[PDB]
Each structure stands twice: as C-alpha cells, then as structure tokens.
Design a protein around this ligand. Structure first.
Ligand SMILES: Cc1cncc2cccc(S(=O)(=O)N3CCCNCC3)c12
Lengths: 353, 20
C-alpha cells in the first residue's frame, strides 16, 4: 500500500488526536456561546489613531488603549446604518461568534461596547495587511508559500466545521497577515452555526460554490470549494473563474471546467480538481473520510500539521513592521469624526450586543 | 493570455460581496 506500518500507525494516531482536540474545543466553545461577555470597555479608554479600513459596515480604526499602551483594531458600526442595511442579525452573530471561538488563526476580540449611536468591537491589531495586497503586489505566491497559508485555512475550517460553523466569506481580502507571517481570519457576520443545510445566497462571486449559485440547499462543503478557489488564486495570481460581470462568472463556475497555468504542479492540479468539484458526491472535504482527504493529499505531504498549529514553522514572508502602531501595510482613508448622538438609537434591536 | 484576460475583466481590485 502507500504507507508502511510505521507511517500508517503515526497517521492513525494523529487523526485520533485531532478528534480528541476537537471534542474539547467544542466543549469550550459551547460554554462561551451560551454565556457571552459584554460591555468590557468604553470609548474614552482609547485614543483613535487612523482609519485602516472602510465598508458598508462602517470603519476599522487603529486605536491605542490609554492604560496599557496596547494597539488594537476597533470596528465601529453605526446602528441606524446597520438597521437600514438589514444587517442586525449578522452583526449580533459576528460578535457572538468572535467572543466564543478560540484558535490561533482566528482574530481575538478583546473588548466590545456600544453607545447611543454606535457599536464597537475591539480586536487585536493585525499589522501585516490583507493577503490581497501582498498577492497583487507580488503577483503570485510560490506553491510552498501558498501551501503555508492553505494549511492554516484547512486547520481553521476543520475547527470551525467541528463547531457546526459554515464560514462562507473566504477570499484574500478577508485574510490578514500577522507580525509572524501567519494568517488571521476576522470576518464572521456571514458565518452560520447549522448542522445540516442552509439556503442564503451570500458571498463573493468568484468564491461561490455552484450549489449556492444554483439556489440549492448547501452545507459546509461550500467552504472546501472556496478553499480551492483561494489556493488557485494564491498560486496563479488570479482566480479560476472570472469575467466582466458576475453572471458570466457563475456560468463558468457551474460548467465543471477549470483550466490551470502551465507552472502548476500535477499534485496541485489534482488537489484543485477535487476541491473545485461541482459534484458534491465527489468533492474533497465532503466524503466519508472528511478533512483527511485534504490533509493527506500529496500536495500537503511536506506539511507538518501540528507544527503549523503550534506556529513553529518559519513563515515564507514577513511583512514590514517598524513598531507597534505601524500602519504602512494598510491603505489610507479619509478621516471622519465619530459622532455620538445625545439620544439612544436602535436600543431594542441591539439589546444583546 | 489568461493573465491579460484577468486584467481585462475589471475585477482585479477588492471584490464586494453580493449584499454590497
Ligand atoms: C485593519 C485590521 C487590522 N487588524 C485587525 C482587524 C480586525 C478586523 C478587521 C480589520 S480590517 O482589515 O479592516 N477588515 C474589515 C473588513 C474587511 N475584511 C478584512 C477585515 C482589521
């Protein structure tokens, strides 16, 4: 067979140890999920330094905690805007997930609070920037470099899926690089805790699994499809399915055809054909052997999964870092005041925040 | 080339989710 006795025994033991880890991790998650923390700071505890990101959600600012001197990323949401955009449930869900999970590649929420006008989530500052920026600048990542990041996503999805969380928001724009060169996953509004199927059309066109596009009920296998898109984009510099308009992207996604750069290794192409598999009965991550089909694939044969988890692998790329509060790996944005109305807005809607 | 086609798509910048 493919493995001799020693290798087969070591792999078997490793897979059993994963099950043991995940069972404990689920116990820990469920305790925090059922008793969430709240109101752990206030706005005047922080100096606001610079805007690091913006979106329909609001903004993320670099802040400095006055008492400790520590820098953090503060996400600021306007309650009335969240209501207008029909994002109440997603916003509450993001905070509840963030305060309950614990994993080395998931960003840590350190404080949360609200005031008359806004909601605030204060997370560890991840100074290395978005993977997106580095990928577009470098052009493409080598297969070892892409593999280092991919392994972290595999472990993170193995953790999330064990908690019955479907992630649904994978893309380079949503992955940050920390000071040691490891990945931080930050966005959880569109994650959903369900054991079976769900039906919402959500995500980003290039990363949507066919079953989402086709308005089917779908499950956690959509995350393994999205991993295939991510690995492809990291290693090629462009995603597997693109076009001028989303409709044409969707036609390519559902077609069952994917083409590869000539520099892709055969091992990489084999992995990608099994992740970018339109037939759910054949997609890696969705079969009887679960995540093991991915972790044991030839493309990952050099990956030491425990060493990645322990953060003992030397990263292939270390972002520039001049000191705490360095913002050079993020873009520049126009600075807007943060206003706090003298009247509470939307109190009922956000009671649980 | 495929790279040129990617540039021509206009989708080389940060991509919005469907709801945005
Ligand atoms: C700057 C930042 C830096 N450290 C930690 C962060 C935590 C959360 C969000 C951001 S972000 O990059 O604005 N971002 C917003 C939504 C877009 N996807 C990526 C997450 C952080």
């Amino acid at each position: 067979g493919h493995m001799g006795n020693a290798a087969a025994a070591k792999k078997g033991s490793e897979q059993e140890s994963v099950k043991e880890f995940l069972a404990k991790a689920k116990e820990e998650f469920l305790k925090k999920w059922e008793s969430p923390s709240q109101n752990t700071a206030q706005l005047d505890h922080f100096d606001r330094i610079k805007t690091l990101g913006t979106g329909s959600f609001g903004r993320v600012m670099l802040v400095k905690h006055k008492e400790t001197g520590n820098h953090y990323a503060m996400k600021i949401l306007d309650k009335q805007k969240v209501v207008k955009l029909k994002q109440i449930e997603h916003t509450l869900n993001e905070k509840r997930i963030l305060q309950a999970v614990n994993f080395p590649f998931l960003v840590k929420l350190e404080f949360s609070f609200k005031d008359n006008s806004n909601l605030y989530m204060v997370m560890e500052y991840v100074p290395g920037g978005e993977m997106f920026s580095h990928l577009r600048r470098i052009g493409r990542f080598s297969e070892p470099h892409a593999r280092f990041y991919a392994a972290q996503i595999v472990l993170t999805f193995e953790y999330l899926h064990s908690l019955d969380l479907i992630y649904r928001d994978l893309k380079p724009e949503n992955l940050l690089i920390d000071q040691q060169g490891y990945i931080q996953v930050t966005d959880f509004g569109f994650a959903k805790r369900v054991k079976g199927r769900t039906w919402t059309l959500c995500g980003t066109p290039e990363y949507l699994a066919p079953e989402i596009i086709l308005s089917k009920g779908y499950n956690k296998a959509v995350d393994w499809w999205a991993l295939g898109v991510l690995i492809y984009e990291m290693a090629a510099g462009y995603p597997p399915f693109f076009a001028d308009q989303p409709i044409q992207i969707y036609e390519k996604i559902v077609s069952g055809k994917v083409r590869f750069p000539s520099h892709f290794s055969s091992d990489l192409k084999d992995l990608l054909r099994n992740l970018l598999q339109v037939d759910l009965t054949k997609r890696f991550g969705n079969l009887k052997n679960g995540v093991n089909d991915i972790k044991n694939h030839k493309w990952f044969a050099t990956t030491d999964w425990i060493a990645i988890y322990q953060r003992k692998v030397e990263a292939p790329f270390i972002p520039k870092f001049k000191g705490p509060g360095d913002t050079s790996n993020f873009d520049d944005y126009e600075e807007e005041e943060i206003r706090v109305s003298i009247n509470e807005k939307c109190g009922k809607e956000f009671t649980e925040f | 080339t495929t790279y040129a086609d990617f540039i021509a798509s206009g989708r080389t910048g940060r991509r919005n989710a469907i709801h945005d």
